[PDB]
From a paper:
Tyr126, Arg157, Asp158, Asn179, Asn180, Gln181, Trp229, and Gln263 in the liganded structures showed smaller vibrations than in the apo structures. These results indicate that side-chain fluctuations converge upon ligand binding. These two conformations were also reported in the BT3683 structure. Asp158 of WT and E208A_Gal3 show greater vibration than WT_Gal and E208Q_Gal3. The role of Asp158 is thought to be a pKa modulator; therefore, its function and conformational stability might be related.
The exo-β-1,3-galactanase is a glycoside hydrolase from the basidiomycete Phanerochaete chrysosporium (Pc1,3Gal43A), which specifically cleaves AGPs. In this context, exo-β-1,3-galactanase (EC 3.2.1.145) specifically cleaves the nonreducing end β-1,3–linked galactosyl linkage of β-1,3-galactans to release d-galactose (Gal). In this study, we solved the apo and liganded structures of Pc1,3Gal43A, which reveal a glycoside hydrolase family 43 subfamily 24 (GH43_sub24) catalytic domain together with a carbohydrate-binding module family 35 (CBM35) binding domain. The N-terminal catalytic domain consists of a five-bladed β-propeller (Gln21–Gly325), as in other GH clan-F enzymes, and the C-terminal domain (PcCBM35) takes a β-jellyroll fold (Thr326–Tyr448) structure, as in previously reported CBM35s.
Author numbering: 22 to 448
Write the structure that this text describes.
Amino acid sequence: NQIVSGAAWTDTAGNTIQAHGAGILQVGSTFYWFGEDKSHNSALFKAVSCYTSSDLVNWSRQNDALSPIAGTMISTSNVVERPKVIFNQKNSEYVMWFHSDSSNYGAAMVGVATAKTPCGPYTYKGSFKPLGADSRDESIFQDDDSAQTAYLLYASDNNQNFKISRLDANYYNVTAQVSVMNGATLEAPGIVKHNGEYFLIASHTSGWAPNPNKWFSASSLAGPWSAQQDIAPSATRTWYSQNAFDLPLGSNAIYMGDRWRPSLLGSSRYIWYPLDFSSGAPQIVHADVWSVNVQAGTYSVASGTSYEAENGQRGGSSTILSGSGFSGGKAVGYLGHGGTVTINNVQSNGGSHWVALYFANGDSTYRNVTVSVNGGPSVLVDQPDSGGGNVVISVPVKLNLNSGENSITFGSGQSNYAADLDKIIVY
Ligand SMILES: *[C@@H]1O[C@H](CO)[C@@H](O)[C@H](O)[C@H]1NC(C)=O
Ligand SMILES: *[C@@H]1O[C@H](CO)[C@@H](O)[C@H](O)[C@H]1NC(C)=O
Ligand SMILES: [Ca+2]
């Protein structure tokens, strides 16, 4: 049980999970992860996937919950985003909502589909504008009152005004507006309850690029909502992610986000972190490797051993850079293109270990770094843009180490410059 944000997560078949824009549903002790299948690197509709698990980590892919229909707004030339599914007790029916759009995002509708079983397949009922207004990024929140009253959370009015509106008793349509934040430019919403209070997590509108996601709280869905506050250090842009789903977990929650990769959408990653409420304000716990016990409502952060890149052995043209965003105030630059750094005396008990690479990449585009263990064949690790040359994020790589001391060499045999390497943490 290791949740490793940024890694290529695979289902029980060993295939990369394709469930972007997550919606989670719990039925009894089984969890259902619905999402966008982007396996052909398209922004257009291929499927709403359905994966099941009892532990939130080992996901078994079922038949797709929603499939395209030519000549409708759920054709393979249209947009189906951010699916969400809730169970209607009155009708014994699962109801899926999603953002339904054209490829230019000019239609701004919701779509609804229904099924008698959690993975369906679902039957599409049509798309519409809620109360006649725009809806783009959306979520569905189901309260725990007696009626299990449900709400659409949505970016409206050309993304400018954020709305919460109550659904009818069938969950088929929006009946009344409940809250509006005019001019808020919020998207990617989700709500999770905590000690009877409602917590809204949302991003701002920066297109595909990540931005600092925010939390708001209220004692009623009608508000008043608190003023936005950060869930993560602002410079990290939510640790390079965008909110997708906020799952309750005991007295805390799990932040489930997407790391969108526009040039390779099917390789967009899943950024899941504990959302810790112990201070009364929710905050992402930046845990490169953590474990979850969904039955206990608990999480456990793995401990690792840190090695500073600047304490490694540089070869060729690599150099030491100084900056306030780096651990130890220093990083190794000019890696790749003839510069290397080798971190020696990496202790291990043997076997396979997750290693987090902390780097800064001030480009607008990705870099990568070659990684070789004890002189073995290199693997190439993608290094997203980090937000600035003085902003560090981490990405994980699983390395086979030997008992005793090990060496890890970065930047050998690549023509391009890698990102600047701050440190590594070996878990
Ligand atoms: C949904 O509810 C609204 C407001 O109550 C109503 O005007 C509308 O006819 C209903 N149906 C649809 C498809 O919007
Ligand atoms: C590695 O990074 C360079 C840019 O520095 C890029 O041109 C190249 O396509 C990347 N390689 C892979 C496999 O992504
Ligand atoms: Ca450092």
